[PDB]
Write a protein that binds this ligand. Structure first.
Ligand SMILES: [Cl-]
Ligand SMILES: [Cl-]
Ligand SMILES: [Cl-]
Lengths: 328, 320
């Protein structure tokens, strides 16, 4: 057997470039009893990988999740053809003993793409689900500010908020994303790169301020939003993508006087905090909302394992509309 | 007649004497309140920016009536600003605790058994949510709030690491029983000092200072660590832009919870019970108090500036 794997040739300086990755071919050992050989069907690239890569040794495999098919099996629980979620990194083939896999929902229908298990009905959707419903604690009727609102996480945040009865103000990085989310029904959507002044745009979008802030971006953008949070406003700190590729010092922080006077609550979280029955129920809620049309999905499918570095870099620069997925 | 301190000129950096102006005024006929003790507090540096030039500096005081619910001689807490005399209709006053003993200074109603002590109580017990066994980082630890925070933490069963601005404050807090105390102005490296003070990190952070100091503390917070954002004094008297924010990757990876608060959020039975607790702990010796008494209403600006620069040990109080 053989496998193709993407490794970190060099730690990223600023945004990644092609020279930071190295494609290597490896010979897999044969199966031992209780193991299976997994062939990747869909592999995800996600913003967190820019940060997690700093913990790698140079030469290590890039981390990441994938939907995979069993092609050979010495384990009866996983017959040839079983579909699983695995995280062996950017690799076409891998060997697993079975304890590091997750079977898809038993109720998974064939009317929606399998790749949604890496998106709206997978890790990004769960991040939106718990970030908004638990960390932000929306009950209905709130005004919610979400940035990267067309990304894998933000798009789910806005649509869950809408089905809960919230007003949604979304910030995105391109006109095409603005038009898409406006057609979905978000109350206000704008391109942060082209606004004449961010402060006036946010003020007009909600004169009374914002109850909740789902933050994927960080940086100066968040300083402006903090200046328009209502008293006791809740901020879910999910990501800081505007800073991940920074080469210089971080931008100034928010004005402390505003944070204190408004008594803001700001909590950071990672989706893996929730496991067991909480995680499983969130997945079923996301599945039902998708099947009812309450949550639309959009994917940017890229063909070819060899193009995975390009998919990752394009995703970081915001060039793709929809969850970026690499189809092997 | 009455004496009043006004904001002659908005502060640039730390205040100076020329930024204040003492004015004499004639009070109208009617209760008349004469100030015995007036407090100066860090929050005034920030609140002063909202003032118009010529306005009275804001502040609280203990006062006694000099001229029916308020007979001549009643002691009250009032906030007419930096003024020796003021007129009140009675609805903006608070009678002291009915059980207030005469064995402790009246001026403690502006301190450990007053607004600063309540800030420590709710910031640590509710916002930080200490239950016992936590390692708590507190800065400005010898100030009115911080000193109460550390002593409440100790009586709750916490380890306390305190940062102060002078060697005299280090010795005082060590005598109070803080596990670790250091002078941030003279430490070779804040990161190394905090790391040895608690190799395992910090469960809670009572933050009165902000700025780069807090960025370093955030890098040593444990997972699910709780931060109570009480003040940002290092940024109050600042020239130039605010310092960079904390590293987002650390905040997210450690899933930190950071909530800001102001003491006035709690009223009614919560506030009364907190006052009752603070007084009881003082009478039991679990919370020691210390005051820096400055004689003369004319010296109130000097008391405020010295307090901001960390020159005063104990709650800064101006006795008229
Ligand atoms: Cl976006
Ligand atoms: Cl994506
Ligand atoms: Cl101090």
């Amino acid at each position: 057997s053989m496998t193709k794997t993407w490794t970190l040739k060099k730690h990223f300086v600023g945004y990644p470039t092609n020279s930071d990755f190295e494609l290597k071919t490896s010979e897999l050992p044969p199966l031992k009893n209780g193991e299976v050989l997994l062939e990747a069907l869909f592999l995800t690239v996600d913003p967190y990988m820019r940060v997690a890569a700093k913990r790698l040794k140079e030469g290590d495999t890039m981390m990441g999740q994938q939907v995979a098919k069993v092609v050979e099996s010495k384990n009866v629980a996983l017959p040839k053809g079983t579909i699983v979620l695995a995280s062996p990194g950017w690799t076409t083939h891998s060997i697993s003993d079975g304890k590091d896999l997750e079977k898809l929902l038993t109720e998974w229908p064939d009317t929606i793409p399998l790749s949604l298990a890496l998106g709206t009905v997978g890790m990004p959707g769960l991040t939106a689900y718990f970030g908004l419903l638990e960390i932000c604690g929306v009950k209905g009727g709130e005004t919610v500010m979400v940035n990267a609102a067309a990304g894998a996480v933000g798009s789910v945040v806005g649509q869950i908020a809408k089905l809960k009865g919230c007003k949604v103000v979304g910030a995105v990085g391109s006109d095409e994303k603005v038009a898409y989310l406006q057609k979905l029904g978000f109350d206000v959507v704008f391109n942060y790169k082209t606004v004449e002044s961010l402060e006036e745009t946010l003020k007009k979008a909600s004169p009374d301020g914002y109850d909740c802030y789902f933050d994927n971006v960080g940086g100066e953008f968040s300083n402006t939003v903090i200046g328009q949070m209502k008293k006791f406003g809740r901020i879910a700190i999910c990501g800081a993508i505007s800073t991940y590729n920074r080469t210089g010092p971080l931008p100034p922080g928010p004005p402390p006087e505003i944070v204190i006077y408004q008594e803001l609550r700001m909590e950071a979280f990672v989706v893996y905090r929730w496991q067991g029955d909480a995680r499983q129920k969130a997945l079923k809620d996301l599945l039902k909302w998708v099947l009812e049309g309450k949550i639309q999905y959009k994917e940017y499918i890229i063909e070819g394992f060899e193009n995975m570095p390009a998919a990752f870099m394009g995703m970081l620069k915001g060039d793709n509309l929809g969850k970026t997925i690499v189809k092997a």
